[PDB]
Scaffold this active site. Structure first.
Site, PDB file in Angstrom:
ATOM      1  N   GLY A   1       0.864  -1.161   0.000  1.00  0.00           N
ATOM      2  CA  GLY A   1       0.000   0.000   0.000  1.00  0.00           C
ATOM      3  C   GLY A   1       0.911   1.224   0.000  1.00  0.00           C
TER       4      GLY A   1
ATOM      5  N   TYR B   1      10.102   2.847   1.380  1.00  0.00           N
ATOM      6  CA  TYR B   1      10.938   1.678   1.626  1.00  0.00           C
ATOM      7  C   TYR B   1      12.367   1.823   1.141  1.00  0.00           C
ATOM      8  CZ  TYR B   1       6.699  -0.758   2.976  1.00  0.00           C
ATOM      9  OH  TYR B   1       5.509  -1.083   3.590  1.00  0.00           O
TER      10      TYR B   1
ATOM     11  N   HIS C   1       9.728   3.848   6.541  1.00  0.00           N
ATOM     12  CA  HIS C   1       9.607   2.423   6.855  1.00  0.00           C
ATOM     13  C   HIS C   1      10.988   1.780   6.845  1.00  0.00           C
ATOM     14  CE1 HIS C   1       5.421   2.770   6.915  1.00  0.00           C
ATOM     15  NE2 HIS C   1       5.120   2.420   5.678  1.00  0.00           N
TER      16      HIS C   1
HETATM   17  C1  LIG Z   1      -3.812  -6.517   7.522  1.00  0.00           C
HETATM   18  C2  LIG Z   1      -3.077  -5.673   6.497  1.00  0.00           C
HETATM   19  C3  LIG Z   1      -1.750  -5.256   6.741  1.00  0.00           C
HETATM   20  C4  LIG Z   1      -1.025  -4.458   5.774  1.00  0.00           C
HETATM   21  N1  LIG Z   1       0.287  -4.110   6.064  1.00  0.00           N
HETATM   22  C5  LIG Z   1       0.992  -3.374   5.134  1.00  0.00           C
HETATM   23  C6  LIG Z   1       2.416  -3.066   5.361  1.00  0.00           C
HETATM   24  O1  LIG Z   1       3.036  -3.433   6.350  1.00  0.00           O
HETATM   25  N2  LIG Z   1       3.078  -2.312   4.379  1.00  0.00           N
HETATM   26  C7  LIG Z   1       2.414  -1.862   3.204  1.00  0.00           C
HETATM   27  O2  LIG Z   1       3.090  -1.211   2.444  1.00  0.00           O
HETATM   28  N3  LIG Z   1       1.129  -2.189   2.945  1.00  0.00           N
HETATM   29  C8  LIG Z   1       0.387  -2.928   3.845  1.00  0.00           C
HETATM   30  N4  LIG Z   1      -0.918  -3.280   3.581  1.00  0.00           N
HETATM   31  C9  LIG Z   1      -1.602  -2.877   2.317  1.00  0.00           C
HETATM   32  C10 LIG Z   1      -1.643  -4.016   1.254  1.00  0.00           C
HETATM   33  O3  LIG Z   1      -0.302  -4.387   0.910  1.00  0.00           O
HETATM   34  C11 LIG Z   1      -2.409  -3.495   0.045  1.00  0.00           C
HETATM   35  O4  LIG Z   1      -3.726  -3.136   0.477  1.00  0.00           O
HETATM   36  C12 LIG Z   1      -2.500  -4.592  -1.044  1.00  0.00           C
HETATM   37  O5  LIG Z   1      -1.190  -4.962  -1.481  1.00  0.00           O
HETATM   38  C13 LIG Z   1      -3.331  -4.049  -2.190  1.00  0.00           C
HETATM   39  O6  LIG Z   1      -3.466  -5.094  -3.362  1.00  0.00           O
HETATM   40  P1  LIG Z   1      -4.635  -6.081  -3.521  1.00  0.00           P
HETATM   41  O7  LIG Z   1      -4.358  -6.881  -4.791  1.00  0.00           O
HETATM   42  O8  LIG Z   1      -4.845  -6.819  -2.374  1.00  0.00           O
HETATM   43  O9  LIG Z   1      -5.909  -5.399  -3.678  1.00  0.00           O
HETATM   44  P2  LIG Z   1      -6.623  -4.003  -4.176  1.00  0.00           P
HETATM   45  O10 LIG Z   1      -6.437  -2.906  -3.163  1.00  0.00           O
HETATM   46  O11 LIG Z   1      -7.879  -4.257  -4.600  1.00  0.00           O
HETATM   47  O12 LIG Z   1      -5.973  -3.298  -5.334  1.00  0.00           O
HETATM   48  C14 LIG Z   1      -5.800  -3.786  -6.672  1.00  0.00           C
HETATM   49  C15 LIG Z   1      -6.225  -2.556  -7.586  1.00  0.00           C
HETATM   50  O13 LIG Z   1      -6.126  -2.994  -9.009  1.00  0.00           O
HETATM   51  C16 LIG Z   1      -7.480  -3.032  -9.580  1.00  0.00           C
HETATM   52  N5  LIG Z   1      -7.502  -4.277 -10.332  1.00  0.00           N
HETATM   53  C17 LIG Z   1      -7.955  -5.521  -9.919  1.00  0.00           C
HETATM   54  N6  LIG Z   1      -7.852  -6.452 -10.873  1.00  0.00           N
HETATM   55  C18 LIG Z   1      -7.309  -5.783 -11.952  1.00  0.00           C
HETATM   56  C19 LIG Z   1      -6.951  -6.222 -13.312  1.00  0.00           C
HETATM   57  N7  LIG Z   1      -7.117  -7.443 -13.741  1.00  0.00           N
HETATM   58  N8  LIG Z   1      -6.414  -5.239 -14.130  1.00  0.00           N
HETATM   59  C20 LIG Z   1      -6.225  -3.938 -13.714  1.00  0.00           C
HETATM   60  N9  LIG Z   1      -6.529  -3.445 -12.493  1.00  0.00           N
HETATM   61  C21 LIG Z   1      -7.071  -4.407 -11.646  1.00  0.00           C
HETATM   62  C22 LIG Z   1      -8.460  -2.935  -8.444  1.00  0.00           C
HETATM   63  O14 LIG Z   1      -9.710  -2.418  -8.838  1.00  0.00           O
HETATM   64  C23 LIG Z   1      -7.690  -2.042  -7.423  1.00  0.00           C
HETATM   65  O15 LIG Z   1      -7.853  -0.650  -7.563  1.00  0.00           O
HETATM   66  C24 LIG Z   1      -1.702  -4.084   4.542  1.00  0.00           C
HETATM   67  C25 LIG Z   1      -3.051  -4.518   4.304  1.00  0.00           C
HETATM   68  C26 LIG Z   1      -3.741  -5.299   5.252  1.00  0.00           C
HETATM   69  C27 LIG Z   1      -5.145  -5.716   4.932  1.00  0.00           C
HETATM   70  C1  LIG Z   2      -3.462  -1.030   5.297  1.00  0.00           C
HETATM   71  N1  LIG Z   2      -2.177  -0.357   5.087  1.00  0.00           N
HETATM   72  C2  LIG Z   2      -1.765   0.457   3.910  1.00  0.00           C
HETATM   73  C3  LIG Z   2      -2.629   0.709   2.742  1.00  0.00           C
HETATM   74  C4  LIG Z   2      -3.649   1.565   2.683  1.00  0.00           C
HETATM   75  C5  LIG Z   2      -4.381   1.777   1.383  1.00  0.00           C
HETATM   76  O1  LIG Z   2      -5.738   2.138   1.637  1.00  0.00           O
HETATM   77  C6  LIG Z   2      -0.491   0.911   4.109  1.00  0.00           C
HETATM   78  C7  LIG Z   2       0.315   1.783   3.165  1.00  0.00           C
HETATM   79  O2  LIG Z   2       0.676   3.023   3.785  1.00  0.00           O
HETATM   80  C8  LIG Z   2       0.017   0.418   5.406  1.00  0.00           C
HETATM   81  C9  LIG Z   2      -1.040  -0.380   6.026  1.00  0.00           C
HETATM   82  C10 LIG Z   2      -0.828  -1.025   7.363  1.00  0.00           C
HETATM   83  O3  LIG Z   2      -1.669  -1.707   7.934  1.00  0.00           O
HETATM   84  C11 LIG Z   2       0.495  -0.808   8.010  1.00  0.00           C
HETATM   85  C12 LIG Z   2       1.516  -0.064   7.465  1.00  0.00           C
HETATM   86  N2  LIG Z   2       2.794   0.071   8.239  1.00  0.00           N
HETATM   87  C13 LIG Z   2       3.453  -1.247   8.546  1.00  0.00           C
HETATM   88  C14 LIG Z   2       4.087  -0.337   7.609  1.00  0.00           C
HETATM   89  C15 LIG Z   2       1.332   0.614   6.090  1.00  0.00           C
HETATM   90  O4  LIG Z   2       2.220   1.293   5.561  1.00  0.00           O
END
Ligand SMILES: Cc1cc2nc3c(=O)[nH]c(=O)nc-3n(C[C@H](O)[C@H](O)[C@H](O)COP(=O)(O)OP(=O)(O)OC[C@H]3O[C@@H](n4cnc5c(N)ncnc54)[C@H](O)[C@@H]3O)c2cc1C
Ligand SMILES: Cn1c(CCCO)c(CO)c2c1C(=O)C=C(N1CC1)C2=O
Ligand SMILES: Cc1cc2nc3c(=O)[nH]c(=O)nc-3n(C[C@H](O)[C@H](O)[C@H](O)COP(=O)(O)OP(=O)(O)OC[C@H]3O[C@@H](n4cnc5c(N)ncnc54)[C@H](O)[C@@H]3O)c2cc1C
Ligand SMILES: Cn1c(CCCO)c(CO)c2c1C(=O)C=C(N1CC1)C2=O
Lengths: 273, 273
Positions: free
Chosen positions: A149, A155, A161
């Site tokens: 995210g 990074y 981070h």
């Molecule tokens: C519990 C938890 C902990 C987290 N901790 C961290 C962390 O420590 N560090 C960090 O950086 N992030 C963190 N995150 C965020 C997480 O990494 C992102 O929310 C995730 O990687 C987003 O990708 P996704 O595929 O899951 O889903 P999505 O958010 O849905 O995103 C994919 C996007 O692409 C679109 N899409 C889907 N299919 C296609 C296709 N075929 N072609 C084109 N577009 C498409 C969708 O509509 C959407 O906009 C955390 C999230 C959670 C739930």
């Molecule tokens: C859930 N989530 C998202 C994504 C949000 C998109 O809506 C991010 C990106 O900033 C992040 C998270 C999260 O849970 C924890 C994060 N810290 C460990 C590093 C982080 O960066």
């Protein structure tokens, strides 16, 4: 070479980009002539919690249960739970293993972490006598396709981070290389939530272009086990001769073996070192 | 000071050293007058897999479910699964939080990882506006009490597994400190499986003796968020003035912020830095 690949995906939605990434890899490897098998942990109702229930036979010591030893015995005598057995069968067959998931709390999602603990059982995935480069999976290659995210600058070395290379180390070295895997460069797609529809589509295609020559890539660098004295008496420490030789070196060997010196750039992100 | 403490145990056996370590901690704090609550995840049959079911109310975008957003929404409106909320109430009430658990694949058990993933919901545990030292748990102090199978030498700078500090970082910095927690020195007990009965006894005693003045301890060192440009437009990078003053320093600030230079010794194991 590799005619067979295993794609492990750890995500609950068919609508996520990770799912899209899984489909992209599958189609790309298939077009090239690979045999593709998947492990959609969520779609598999996968149990990620190690317990005595992973052993269907009779424990050697029911009063003081110890997972390591019990699960090994279970492995040897053939009584591991049917689901663990079926993943072990996929791993054995696979040449290439692709781990597709979203970064969650600086690591792999609980469900995938569980997959490793219940599947990467002693004797099967590793032995103390044959660690790292000499592990059971040494003829295989592994790659991590991560989505985040947070953006990429968060990074970087100056990013809040911190260095991603440090985050990747525990997984790629600790789990993958330890069992003999040749870890290829991670496929990192930053802030997928802030990416234009056009960009996202290119990411999918880039991923697919890569998979066309994935097997010929030079894997990431990890210090060979030959530089250490592989025995409990020695403490599995780096050979004295090696320590002396490295005192003249500016950079450490890897992130885990930074040796108090500098860490060679993108050691866990870029190959050739 | 702190009157309340929460202990999160991540082990299935009550006959394990971890359970013994958890009991000692409890006994010790209670003798000194603390209110002690516990989260025995295995004992609680804790569900560690995040899903849409963590949300009991009406989702905002049920067809394109995104955990982060939906979960923050359920938190703010109060429709987070009851079990998750029960754990959240434990955190809010605690001053001290101890995490007891065996090292598994260079990280926390899957059941603990999942606990973090489901209990550390946005707004509640973190906010991008209040990252790290300014996080919601900034008046709280957290400690890791870890047990290991490998020896301490294996995790030294010249050991095969490489620096333990690198393994600790993603957890202590990325999870605990990111949320505001003041992370205290980890309690690391190596190769507990190869430790004499008498040694194990003293280990239990040193833990208890430590917990007597745990609150007065100076926490581990993390670069303060005041050094970084906390805004997307800037990419959350270290301010230039700060980058400039560090150019002449020999050591980096921490494991994640080694800055391509030398990581200060035991940045993640010993305090004062
Ligand atoms: C519990 C938890 C902990 C987290 N901790 C961290 C962390 O420590 N560090 C960090 O950086 N992030 C963190 N995150 C965020 C997480 O990494 C992102 O929310 C995730 O990687 C987003 O990708 P996704 O595929 O899951 O889903 P999505 O958010 O849905 O995103 C994919 C996007 O692409 C679109 N899409 C889907 N299919 C296609 C296709 N075929 N072609 C084109 N577009 C498409 C969708 O509509 C959407 O906009 C955390 C999230 C959670 C739930
Ligand atoms: C859930 N989530 C998202 C994504 C949000 C998109 O809506 C991010 C990106 O900033 C992040 C998270 C999260 O849970 C924890 C994060 N810290 C460990 C590093 C982080 O960066
Ligand atoms: C899936 C998995 C992955 C792992 N990955 C790693 C890894 O990456 N790195 C690594 O180093 N290790 C790893 N390990 C090993 C693990 O860290 C050790 O097996 C564990 O820490 C041993 O401690 P324990 O408390 O769980 O249990 P036990 O093995 O039971 O040991 C506790 C010992 O203390 C005794 N004892 C119990 N209670 C008391 C008491 N009150 N007083 C005195 N003695 C007592 C017991 O009889 C026993 O001998 C892994 C294990 C598993 C199952
Ligand atoms: C189960 N187990 C034990 C303990 C064995 C006690 O006899 C050790 C310690 O060497 C280890 C394991 C294990 O499963 C994986 C290990 N690799 C990740 C680093 C490891 O070192």
């Amino acid at each position: 070479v590799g005619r067979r690949a295993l794609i492990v995906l750890a995500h609950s939605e068919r609508t996520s980009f990770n799912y899209a990434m899984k489909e992209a890899a599958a189609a790309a490897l298939k077009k090239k002539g690979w045999e593709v098998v998947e492990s959609d942990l969520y779609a598999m109702n996968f149990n990620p919690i190690i317990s005595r229930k992973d052993i269907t036979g009779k424990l050697k010591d029911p009063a003081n249960f110890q997972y390591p030893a019990e699960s090994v015995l279970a492995y040897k005598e053939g009584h591991l739970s049917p689901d663990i057995v079926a993943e072990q069968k996929k791993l054995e067959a696979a040449d290439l293993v692709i781990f597709q998931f979203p970064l969650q709390w600086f690591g792999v999602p609980a469900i995938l972490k569980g997959w490793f603990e219940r599947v990467f059982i002693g004797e099967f995935a590793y032995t103390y006598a044959a660690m790292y480069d000499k592990g059971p999976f040494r003829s295989k290659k592994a790659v991590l396709s991560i989505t985040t995210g947070g953006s990429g600058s968060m990074y970087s070395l100056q990013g809040i981070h911190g260095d991603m290379n440090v985050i990747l180390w525990p997984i790629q070295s600790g789990i993958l290389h330890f069992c003999g895997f040749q870890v290829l460069e991670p496929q990192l797609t930053y802030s997928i939530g802030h990416t234009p529809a056009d960009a996202r589509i290119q990411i999918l295609e880039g991923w697919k272009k890569r998979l066309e020559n994935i097997w010929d890539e030079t894997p990431l660098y990890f210090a060979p086990s030959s530089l250490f004295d592989l025995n409990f008496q020695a403490g599995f420490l780096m050979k004295k001769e090696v320590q002396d030789e490295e005192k003249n070196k500016k950079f450490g060997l890897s992130v885990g073996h930074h040796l108090g010196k500098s860490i060679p750039t993108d050691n866990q992100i870029k190959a050739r070192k």
